[PDB]
Amino acid sequence: PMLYKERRETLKMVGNRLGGLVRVAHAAQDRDLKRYFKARRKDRRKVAEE
Amino acid sequence: VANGHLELIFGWLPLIGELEGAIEYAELPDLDFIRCHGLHTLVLQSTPW
């Protein structure tokens, strides 16, 4: 098992960056959208594309 | 009456002077200025530590 240490490291210990992608997503691209749900139909014609 | 109405209109004449002066004063072309701002942003990335 000590022969696979560096390999497991470069496999997952660095792969945590990929997990960091979903963090920003869940934090901003779906939580900050609370404004679209409160605006009148007159603003959905723009907020969707925005 | 021919003399009274003439005197009356001659006395009314001067007031029309200042009335037209005020009318001209209302047409003076003047104005100010307006100015605004704005800012949009966008997140880039992030990683733990």
User: To the nearest whole angstrom, how far is the Cα of B45 from the nearest Cα of chain A?
Assistant: 7
Inter-chain CB proximity A16 and B45 less than 8 Å: no
Q: Which residues of chain B neighbour A16 with C-beta distances below 8 Å?
A: 47-48
Instruction: State how far the Cα of B23 lies from the Cα of B30, in Å rounded to an integer.
Output: 15
Residue partners of A28: CB distance under 8 A and separation at least 6 = B43
DSSP string, B2-47: HHHHHHHHHHHHHHHHHHHHHHHHHT--------------------
CB distance B47–A16 less than 8 Å? yes
C-alpha of A3 from chain center: 34
Say what the resolution is, in angstroms: 3.9
The method of structure determination was cryo-EM
Within 8 A of B43 by CB-CB distance, chain A residues are: 24, 28
